[PDB]
Amino acid sequence: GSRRYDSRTTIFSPEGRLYQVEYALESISHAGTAIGIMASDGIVLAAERKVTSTLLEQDTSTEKLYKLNDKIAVAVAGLTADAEILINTARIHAQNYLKTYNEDIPVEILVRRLSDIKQGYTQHGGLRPFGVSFIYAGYDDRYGYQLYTSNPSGNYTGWKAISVGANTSAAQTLLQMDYKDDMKVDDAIELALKTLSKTTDSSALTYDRLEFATIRKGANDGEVYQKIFKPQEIKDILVKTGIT
Amino acid sequence: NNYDGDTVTFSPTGRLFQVEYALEAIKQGSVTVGLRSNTHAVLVALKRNADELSSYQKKIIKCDEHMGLSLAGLAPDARVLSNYLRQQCNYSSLVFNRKLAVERAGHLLCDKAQKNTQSYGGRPYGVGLLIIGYDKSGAHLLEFQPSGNVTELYGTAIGARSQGAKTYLERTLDTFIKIDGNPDELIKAGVEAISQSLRDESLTVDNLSIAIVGKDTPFTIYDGEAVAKYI
Amino acid sequence: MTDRYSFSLTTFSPSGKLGQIDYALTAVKQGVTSLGIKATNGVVIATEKKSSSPLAMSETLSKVSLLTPDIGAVYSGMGPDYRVLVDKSRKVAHTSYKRIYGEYPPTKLLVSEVAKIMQEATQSGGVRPFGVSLLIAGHDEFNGFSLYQVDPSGSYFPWKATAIGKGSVAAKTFLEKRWNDELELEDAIHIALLTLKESVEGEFNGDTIELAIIGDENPDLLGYTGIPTDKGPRFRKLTSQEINDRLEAL
Amino acid sequence: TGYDLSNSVFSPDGRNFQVEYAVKAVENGTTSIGIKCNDGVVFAVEKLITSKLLVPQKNVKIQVVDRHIGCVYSGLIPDGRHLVNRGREEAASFKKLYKTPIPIPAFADRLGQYVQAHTLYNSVRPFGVSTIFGGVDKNGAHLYMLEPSGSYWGYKGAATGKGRQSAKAELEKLVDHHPEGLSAREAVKQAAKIIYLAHEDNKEKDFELEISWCSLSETNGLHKFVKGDLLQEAIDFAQKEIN
Amino acid sequence: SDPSSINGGIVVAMTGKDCVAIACDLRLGSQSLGVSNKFEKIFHYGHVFLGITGLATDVTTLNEMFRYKTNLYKLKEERAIEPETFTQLVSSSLYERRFGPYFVGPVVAGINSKSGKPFIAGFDLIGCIDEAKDFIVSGTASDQLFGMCESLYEPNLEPEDLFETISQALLNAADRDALSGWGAVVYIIKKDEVVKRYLKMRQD
Amino acid sequence: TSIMAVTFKDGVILGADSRTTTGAYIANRVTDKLTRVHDKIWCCRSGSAADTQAIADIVQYHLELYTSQYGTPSTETAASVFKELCYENKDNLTAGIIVAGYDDKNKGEVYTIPLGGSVHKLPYAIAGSGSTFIYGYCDKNFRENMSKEETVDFIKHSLSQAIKWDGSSGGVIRMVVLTAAGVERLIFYPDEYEQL
Amino acid sequence: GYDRHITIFSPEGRLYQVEYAFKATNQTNINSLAVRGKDCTVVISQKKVPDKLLDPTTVSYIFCISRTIGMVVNGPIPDARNAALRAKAEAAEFRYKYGYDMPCDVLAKRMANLSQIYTQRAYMRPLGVILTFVSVDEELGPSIYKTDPAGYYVGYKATATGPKQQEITTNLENHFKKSKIDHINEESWEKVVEFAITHMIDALGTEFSKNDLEVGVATKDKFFTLSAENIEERLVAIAEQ
Amino acid sequence: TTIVGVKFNNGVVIAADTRSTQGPIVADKNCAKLHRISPKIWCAAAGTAADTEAVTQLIGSNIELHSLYTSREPRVVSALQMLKQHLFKYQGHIGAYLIVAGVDPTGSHLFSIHAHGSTDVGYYLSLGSGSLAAMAVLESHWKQDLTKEEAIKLASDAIQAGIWNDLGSGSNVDVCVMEIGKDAEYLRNYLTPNVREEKQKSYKFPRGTTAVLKESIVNICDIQEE
Ligand SMILES: *[B]([O])([O])[C]([C][C]([C])[C])[N]C(=O)[C]([C]C1=[C][C]=[C][C]=[C]1)[N]C(=O)C1=[C]N=[C][C]=N1
Ligand SMILES: *[B]([O])([O])[C]([C][C]([C])[C])[N]C(=O)[C]([C]C1=[C][C]=[C][C]=[C]1)[N]C(=O)C1=[C]N=[C][C]=N1
Ligand SMILES: [Cl-]
Ligand SMILES: [Mg+2]
Ligand SMILES: [Mg+2]
Ligand SMILES: [Mg+2]
Ligand SMILES: [Mg+2]
Known about the structure:
This is part of a larger assembly, with 8 protein chains of 8 kinds.
Chain B: H1 17-28, E1 32-36, E2 40-46, E3 60-64, E4 67-73, H2 75-96, H3 102-118, E5 127-135, E6 138-144, E7 150-152, E8 155-158, H4 162-176, H5 183-194, E9 208-214, E10 217-223
Antiparallel strand pairs in B: 1-2, 1-8, 2-9, 3-4, 4-5, 5-6, 6-7, 9-10
Helix pairs in contact in B: 2-3, 4-5
Chain G: H1 16-24, E1 32-36, E2 41-46, E3 62-64, E4 70-74, H2 77-98, H3 104-120, E5 130-137, E6 141-147, E7 153-156, E8 158-161, H4 165-179, H5 189-204, E9 213-219, E10 222-225, H6 228-239
Antiparallel strand pairs in G: 1-2, 1-8, 2-9, 3-4, 4-5, 5-6, 6-7, 9-10
Chain H: E1 3-8, E2 11-17, E3 20-22, E4 25-28, E5 34-38, E6 41-47, H1 49-70, H2 76-89, E7 96-104, E8 107-113, E9 119-121, E10 124-127, H3 131-141, H4 148-165, E11 173-179, E12 184-191, E13 212-217
Antiparallel strand pairs in H: 1-2, 1-10, 2-11, 3-4, 5-6, 6-7, 7-8, 8-9, 11-12
The structure holds ligand BO2 (2 copies), chloride ion and magnesium ion (4 copies).
One magnesium ion binds next to loops of chain F.
C-alpha cells in the first residue's frame, strides 16, 4: 500500500530530536538575516532581502516584514509562502479576539496561538512542518513593548534583542556586546543596521537589500504607530547612521 | 520473501503469502475432527492446555439451535467469525422465520474472509473452522479455511497431525455414513478418528470435547464427565 | 479504492532543501522561455508557441490566458499544470473576491490566491508541487500596473521586467540593459520581441509567438453599451497580424 | 527494480506486473470453458476431487446472476464469488431502474469496469480469476471472458485455467467444422468432451464434471444446471470419445 | 414579537454639495420600556460610515462583523475600503444569511476618497441595495422619515444647511414614533473633516 | 390541462392542449406540453409545470446516458425511469405524466403515471383536469388498430370537448405522431376544433 | 528509486510513471488516423483479431461518446473503456447542466484535466491511453482533439497515433504541404474515408481487407461507425481507380 | 413590477419599470431591474429584489467561468438551465421571477422563468404585478416580423401600461436591446414621464434653527507619526 512512500515527518530520532524540525531549522539558517531590537520607547525590526536583482520592483515588494494588526508586526526567515499561510491565520486570530472581547489581542496570546499551530505539525497529521521562523514585534497595555521568536518546533521565547536566519551566532554576539537596557529607538535603529552590515554575506549593505520597520509609542497624543520604511526612507537612515 | 509484507501483494508465481502464513497458524493449532451420517453430524475436538494448572481452551462454539462449529488456530478470530454466523443465523430467523441453510452459512463465511485478503490494512483470519448442522436438506459438514475456501464434506479434520484422522475417515467413509439413528456410534467413530492424530498424550476427561446435531437433536456440547462414556 | 496518501510527499532533506520544489524548478528550467516587461502605461507578457507537430493547430493551445478583464498570465514548465491553475485562478477570483466585493480582485491579491494554491501542493498530503512558474501581469485602480512571478514553492515577487524558463539567464541580462522607468507600452513590446528572438531557434513570426498586453481600456471589446463606468477589458491578446507589423520595424 | 511490489505501478515496459502475477494464480486453477451455440450458451468446469470425503454434486462452482446469466471462473475461488456478488448488485440496480433484465454486453462492462478499478490503486489487489460468463438477452446469445486486467471480449468459445491450451485447440476445431452453428444439446455434449480432454493436464487426481446452460429453446432463455439423465448422457459421450 | 420593532430606532442619510450627512436617534427599549438613551446606531470603518437600525443584538453583532472584515480588507489591500465596495460587502454578508437573516436596516454613507463623489446606500434585511442620489431612511419611523425627507430635501445643499435639513427630518419623524427619539446624533461628513453633533430633542 | 396518448396501427399519437394557468389567469396560452425524452419516446405533462419539467429533464438525461452505453431504450424503460422519480419523490411532487413511444419490435406503447407514481400500460390514456369530462366520450369512441387519420380525429374531437368544458384547458391542440416513418408535429387552432 | 513508482518529480524534473504510461499506449500494436473533410471528420484504425475464437464484432477501439462525438483509443482496452464510460457520463452531465451538446474540444479538455490530476495525485495512476476525439462541432466545424497520459491536449488538422505514427504523420504532412489547406477538399464523407484508407495504405505499406479496418465518421448532428460491408464498398472504390 | 420581453427581426428587446415597494411605500423610485448576466444575455427581474440580484449575479459569475473554460461565448439556454435548476432546488423560496433574453452563436432567444423553476418560450412575455396591464397591450399590438423600432415601441408601451394602471409599478422605463451581430445597447431611463413638479415653497432652514448640546471632531485618520 501507501506506507512504502511515507517519510514519517512526526517521529523522534534515537537521540530524541524531531528530524524534520531540525532540517527545517537548517533551511532557515540559509535565509536572509532578520533582527529585532526592543528599546524603552519602541521596537526596531530590520531584515535583509535575499534576491538582489536590479530589475526587482522594491517599493511594491514584501518578503520579510508583515503587518499582523495595528499593534503587532512580524519579520520572517525561511519559506515566504509558508510564512504567508501562517500570517493570514494570525491576522484572523487577532480579529477573532477583537470581535469576542472588544480589545486588541495581547502579543503573547497571538504568538502562543501561532506557535501551537506549528507544534501541531510536529506531533500529528504526517505533514512537513512550516519552514519559518518569526520575530514578533508588538505592543499591548499589559507588558508594553515585547519581542518574541518562534521556530518550526513551535517553541517561542521572549527577547530584548534577537536575530533569526543566517549568521545568528555572529549576530547574537554583536547584539550582546552593544545592547544596553536604557537604550532608545534611534540607538536601536543604529545597532540593528550595524549588526546586519557586519554579518551580511554581501560586499556592502544598501537600501535595495533591506526591509526596515519601527513600532513607536511616539505617535500624536500617546498612541502606537507602525512604520514600514519605504525604500527612500531606508536610504536616508543608512546615510544618517553612516554606513553608506 | 519480498511479497509477504501485506495481504494486498501477489508473489511472482501468483501466491498470497500472508494468507499462507494464516493457513500455517491452523496447522499449529490443536486437532479437531468432523464427520456425519444422513441423520446426525458430529464434532470432536482435542482441547489444549497451557500447563497442568491451566484450563483446556474451548474448541467448540454454538451458532444456533441447529448449527455450530469447532475451531483450530487463533481463538479470537473464531470468536469474531462465530459471532458473525450467530448474527446471520439470527437475521434469517427474525426476518424470514427461516433456519439458515448450512451451505449458505459457508458462503457467508467465505465472502467475509475474502474481503480481508484483497484490501490493505486488514489481515486474513488466522483460524480454520469445521461447521456442522442439520437443516431442511439433512445433515451437513463444512470445512472453512481463511483463504475463503469453504468445502462441504462427509468427514474431515484440521490442526496438528490432522492427516492421521483424515486418512482413517477416508477408509471408514462407507461405514460411518450409514450410522443413522444412532448418535453414540457416530461419536465413537469420531473419537476413534481423532485418536489417529494423537502422539504421547491420550484422551482424558477434561481433554476431550464433543458436539452433536441431528434430526431431533439440537446442537449440544459435551465436556467433562459427560464425555467419560466415550473414553 | 482509498486515498491513503494523507502524508507529505515534499519533505525537508538533511541539508534543508525541499527536494520536490527544487525538482519542480528544474522542470521549469527545461520549459520554453516566457517573459514580462512593465511600461509606464502598460505591461506586456510574451512566449514562444512551441508546436509539438506541424499538423497540430497551435491557435487552439493558448499559453497566454485571461484571468480577469484586467489580469493576464503566461508560464514556463508543464502546460497541463498551468491549464488547471488558470481554471482555479479564474474561479478563485470569483468565489473569494467578486462574489463578496462586487468587483474583480487587484493583481497582487489574485496572485496571492494562486500562490496559496501552489503552496498547498507543496505541503498537503499525497500531491507533488506544480511544475510551473507563472508570470502574472495586471492592472487595478489603486495599485496601477504590475507584474508578478509565482514559483512552485508558492513564493511570489513583483518585477519591473523578468524572464523564466529555458534562456532566462541570458534574457534577464538583456532586459537589465534595455529597461528604464520611462518606457511607453510600444517600447516594451519592441523590447519583448527583441528579447524573445534570442531564445527562439526556428521560425519567428506572429504564428509562432504568443503575446498579450495589459494596457488601455478596450470599450470595443466589451460587447455592450449603456454603462459609463464599465469601460472594457485592459487585457488584450495581440493578433498574428499585429505581431508581424511590429516585426517589420524591428 | 521494485516495479512488481505494488499494484497500479507501470514498469518501464508499460506493464502492471501485479496483474501479470494475478494471471499466474488463474493459470494455476482448474479448467473452465464456455461454448456459444445457436440460441444460447453452455458453461462447464473441472472440479478436482481432492478426497473421497468430498460430497458429490454439492460444492457447486458455476453461479447464476439475475435469472439469465451464468458465470464460471478459474483461479482464486473466493475472488470469483466476490465478483459475482458485485455482478448481482449491478444486475439488480439495472433492473430496478430500467425494468428490463441487464443485457449481456451491458453486464460484461459492469464486471470489466469493476475489475479494472482494482488495477488503479496500490491499496487493492487485482482479481485472481479469469471469468467466463454469458447468457441470452433481447439481441440473442452472448459469451464473454474477463481477465484480471479488466480486459474482456466476446467469444465463440472460451477457456481458462490449467487446461486452457488443450481446450482452446478443441474449441477451434468446433468453430471450423460448424460455421452454420452448433445446437444447444450438441454444445452440452462437446463441453463434456472438452473438460475430459483438458483433464490430461490435471490427470493425477480424478474429477467431477459440472455443466450449465442458457438456451432460448431448451431453457426459455433462463440459466439452468444440467442434471440427471442429460448430464449422464454428456458424461457417456465424453467417456466414449477419450477411449 | 416582530424583531424589527422590539428595540426601536431610526437612521437617515442625505447627500449635499461635496458632502454627506448621516443621523440616528439614541433610544434602546424593550417595547414600551425605555432602557438606554446612549445607544448610538452609527459606526465607522475608516472614512465609510454605517448606520444600523433594527434588532439591537444584530446591530452590535454586525458592527463587530464589519469591523472584523474591514480590518482584514485593509491589511491585505493596503488601503481603506471605499463606500461603493463596502456597500457590496454589506449586501454579500446579509444575503449569505438569506433564510436566517439579521433583523436590521443598514445605511452606508461616505465620500469616495479618489473620485470625491458623495455616496449613500440603504439595504433591506437580506441585502438588496438601494443606492439613492438624494436620501436613505431606515427604522421604525421610516414612513415618517420618507415624508420629511421627500418634502424638506433639495439637492446640492452646503454642509451647514444640510445639517439643518437632516436634523429637522430626524427630529420631527422621531416625535411621531413611540419607539424612536430619546436623543439624536448627526454626522456631517466632508472629504477630510467630519463633525459630530448631539441634538437637543424632547425626552419622551 | 387535457392530455392524451393513443396507440393505433402504425404507432402512437400524443395530444395536448396549450394552456398554463395561475389560478384563473392564463400565464401561457401557447404552451408545449408534449416533450421529447428520446428520439421516439415522448411524454405528455400535466400538474406542476416546474415539477414535470424537472422530471422530464432528468429523464432525458438518464436516457441519453442509457443510449451512450446500451443503445436505444425501450418505451417501458423510459416509463420506469419516470416512475422511479415520481414514486420515490411522491411527497414533494405534483406530476401526472403519460409516456408514449415507438419501437419497431413493440410498435406503439402508452404508459400512464398518475400522482402516486404507479405505472399503467394502456391502449390509450387520458389525464389532466380536463380529462374528467371526456371519460365517457373516449370509452365509447376508442377502437384498437385505428388508422392515422381516425386517431387524429379521435384526439381532436376528445380534446375539443375537454377544452370546451374545462377552464384550465384551452388554446391550440398540439399533437405528435410517432411511427416508423419518423416524428410529425401537428397543430390545430380554435376556429377548426370549436366548430366540431 | 521510489520517484519512479509514483507520480512525483525525479531530480531531472520528470514524471517516470507518466512516461511509462505513454509506452503502455502502444501495447495493442494498432495504428489510428484522423482527418477532416468539408462537412465531416473521419477516423480510421487497424483492427486485429488474432484469435479465431473471438467474436470479431465485439473487438473495437472506437466509441460513440455522444450523438455528435466519437472517440478512438490507442492503448489497452480496460483503460480505453474506463475513459469511454467517463467521457459518456461527462458528455451527458454537460448537456443536462448547461442545456446544449458538449463540444468535442471541451470534452477533450475535461478528460485532459482528469488525466492531469492522475499526474499530480499519488494514489491515482495515469491511464495508459491516448484519446482521439472527433466531431463536426456546431461552432468550430470538423474537429479533431487528442488527449494523452500527461494531461496534454491540442486541436489537429489531421493526426495519427500508434507504433508507426511518425510514418503516417509525415505522409499526411506532405499531402497538406501540397494542397495548402487545413482539410480534405471533398464533398462526401465516403471519399474522405477513401482518402484516409488510401494514405494509411501508402504510409504503412500494407493492403487491407474489410476485416482489417475499423472506421468512424462524424457528420453534422451524428457520429457513426461503418460496418464491414460499408468498408468493403470503400475498398472496392479505392482498387477501381 | 412590470417587465416585458419582445422578439423582433434580428434580436430581442427587454424592458422594465423602475419602482420597488414594501407594502404601500415606494422604497426606490429609480430601481434598476435589467440585469446583465453576460455581455449579450440580459434579464428583467420581478419578485424579491435581493433574490433576483443574487440569482443573476451567481449564474452570471458561473456563466463567465463557463465561457472562459469552453472558449465560447455564453448561450441563453445555459443561463436558463442554470437558473431553473437552482430555483427548483430551493422549491420557490428564492423569490425570483425573470424574463431572460439574449443573442449568442445559436441566434436570438426569449424566455421567462418563475420562482419554482418552470420556464416558458415566447415571442412576447410579461411578468410582475403589472403583467396583466402589459400583456393586454402586447396582445392588442403584437405581430410577427416586428422591426427593431416597432419592438422597442411595443415594449415601452407595455411598461407604460404597467406604470399608469398598476400601483406596484411606476416612474421610468428602462430598455435593453440585443441584436444579432451587434453590441447589446442598455438604455437606462429610456422614458422619463414622471418628473416631480417644482414645489411651492423652499424648506431650507435658517442656520441655528436646530438646538445642539455638544460638538466634536471625529478622528477618521489612522494613528499618526511623531
Ligand atoms: B395543466 O393545467 O395541468 C398544466 C400542465 C403544465 C405542464 C403546464 N398545469 C398548470 O398550468 C399549473 C397549475 C395547475 C392546473 C391544474 C392542475 C394542476 C396544476 N400551472 C403552473 O404550474 C404554473 C403556472 N404559472 C406559472 C408557473 N407554473
Ligand atoms: B417588483 O414589484 O416585482 C419588484 C422587483 C424588484 C426586483 C425591485 N419587487 C419589489 O420591489 C419587492 C416587492 C416585495 C415586497 C415584499 C416582499 C417581497 C417582495 N420589494 C423588495 O424586494 C424590497 C422592498 N424594500 C426594500 C428592499 N427590497
Ligand atoms: Cl475540469
Ligand atoms: Mg418619540
Ligand atoms: Mg415616552
Ligand atoms: Mg377552455
Ligand atoms: Mg499517481
